[PDB]
Amino acid sequence: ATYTVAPGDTLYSIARRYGTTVEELMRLNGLESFLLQPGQVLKLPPPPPEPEALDPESPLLRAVLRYLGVPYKYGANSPLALDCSAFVAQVYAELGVALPRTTKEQYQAFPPVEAPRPGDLVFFSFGGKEVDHVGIYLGRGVFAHASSYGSRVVIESLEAPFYRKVYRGARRVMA
Amino acid sequence: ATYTVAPGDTLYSIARRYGTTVEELMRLNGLESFLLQPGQVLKLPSRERTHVVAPGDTLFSLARRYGTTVEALMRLNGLSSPEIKVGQVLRLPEPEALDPESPLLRAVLRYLGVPYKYGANSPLALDCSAFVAQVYAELGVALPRTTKEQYQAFPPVEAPRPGDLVFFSFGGKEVDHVGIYLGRGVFAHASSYGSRVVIESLEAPFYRKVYRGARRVM
Numbered sequence A: 001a002t003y004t005v006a007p008g009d010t011l012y013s014i015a016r017r018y019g020t021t022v023e024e025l026m027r028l029n030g031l032e033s034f035l036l037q038p039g040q041v042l043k044l045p046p047p048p049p050e051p052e053a054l055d056p057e058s059p060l061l062r063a064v065l066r067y068l069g070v071p072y073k074y075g076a077n078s079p080l081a082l083d084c085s086a087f088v089a090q091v092y093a094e095l096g097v098a099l100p101r102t103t104k105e106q107y108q109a110f111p112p113v114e115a116p117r118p119g120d121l122v123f124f125s126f127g128g129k130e131v132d133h134v135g136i137y138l139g140r141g142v143f144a145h146a147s148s149y150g151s152r153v154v155i156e157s158l159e160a161p162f163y164r165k166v167y168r169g170a171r172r173v174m175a
Numbered sequence B: 001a002t003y004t005v006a007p008g009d010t011l012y013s014i015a016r017r018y019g020t021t022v023e024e025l026m027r028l029n030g031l032e033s034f035l036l037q038p039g040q041v042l043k044l045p046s047r048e049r050t051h052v053v054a055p056g057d058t059l060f061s062l063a064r065r066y067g068t069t070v071e072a073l074m075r076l077n078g079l080s081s082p083e084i085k086v087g088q089v090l091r092l093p094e095p096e097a098l099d100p101e102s103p104l105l106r107a108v109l110r111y112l113g114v115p116y117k118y119g120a121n122s123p124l125a126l127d128c129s130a131f132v133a134q135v136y137a138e139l140g141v142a143l144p145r146t147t148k149e150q151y152q153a154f155p156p157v158e159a160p161r162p163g164d165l166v167f168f169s170f171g172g173k174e175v176d177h178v179g180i181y182l183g184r185g186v187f188a189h190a191s192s193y194g195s196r197v198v199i200e201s202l203e204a205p206f207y208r209k210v211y212r213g214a215r216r217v218m
Helices: A011-017 A022-029 A059-067 A080-093 A103-109 A161-166 B011-017 B022-029 B059-066 B103-109 B124-137 B147-151 B205-210
Strands: A002-004 A041-043 A121-124 A133-139 A142-146 A153-157 A167-171 B002-004 B041-043 B049-052 B089-092 B165-168 B177-183 B186-190 B197-201 B211-215
Touching: A011 A022, A011 B124, A022 A041, A059 A080, A059 A133, A059 A153, A080 A103, A080 A133, A080 A142, A080 B011, A080 B022, A103 A121, A103 A133, A103 A167, A161 A167, B011 B022, B022 B041, B049 B059, B103 B124, B103 B177, B124 B147, B124 B177, B124 B186, B147 B165, B147 B177, B147 B211, B205 B211
Parallel strands: none
Antiparallel strands: A002 A041, A121 A133, A121 A167, A133 A142, A142 A153, A153 B197, B002 B041, B049 B089, B165 B177, B165 B211, B177 B186, B186 B197
16 A cells, blocks of 8 residues: 655665556656655555675676776787687686686686576677677676677676577686 | 786786786786786886987987986997997887766666666657666656657757766657766666666667767756
8 A cells, every 4th residue: 555665765666566667656656756765655556586686886896897888808909709708807807716718718617507697607609600709697687798899898688689699608607 | 027916906907007918918928817916026018119320329329318328228239339320220128987986877787687667568768768767866866757858858968978868769760769878988778678777888880870969967
């Protein structure tokens, strides 16, 4: 019937918790803005499990964020297939985890995890031929990698059609 | 040349400072990994410098011009006397932005990977702008719901600075998509694939093509 907004709550989190939508929640409360102060009482029209997710202050994310939007070129005129696995190694280096240079080695050296969790490496076949691209899974179906566009570091969705197609599996490198 | 590793230093950060690549930096030092202890001493690449002796030049004058002695400049070139002739070749010795600790970026990162679906059956043109309004709600700025309203109700800006709303026309008919420009030419938005929030490059061919300008709400 009624919900009282707790600190950190959002219209998204509340709508999702009670199996409705932000729209319905705004309509039924006559809200015209997404602004939400603690103690605010919202009318409402079995809590679902929470996806594992990195913290904005996590060592893994902070490392990724340092390079976010920055092109990561391994050598003078190095190909993307080298840049992507060199970026992955560089991030993990900031965490004390040594990693092999090449995407291939990274793929073969580590044990396969069927459903990846925050920290695992996800691999793809861009050219179709072989596993030739790698990124760092961040949780919630997104991963960080050096992209085709100038090897700039970006965060994209694993559940995009292109990536679902070029997908090649995940590997574990930490605990 | 020589550099000693400080805590928090990386191959990338070191290569950048001394104007070289991570690849060469590893090869030259026989590194088997990117792992770098703060007690380490990495050999830096040395650049080759030559000088063709012009009229008026002497070994004493060239010594103080490049930062060396006449004796040092003599060994390197295998001379016995300070004699150089005109035309002789002498060897000679020897931008970012993003801040994780930021109100705007703290809020954005809160939604990474989240499928921000505003309604039960809402279009991406609505999802993306609801998301933008959602992030700014945590920064005390009340924005409209729709893309169309965020587009034509705020001052247009030539180039975008972090925070500004970047607009696109995925459809072609009208402006129907919006994101939050973060800096370094990347923007946060609800993606077409599943309304998932991602952070993509503004400089990708497609987005550079369907770009429709930037607006300032702050």
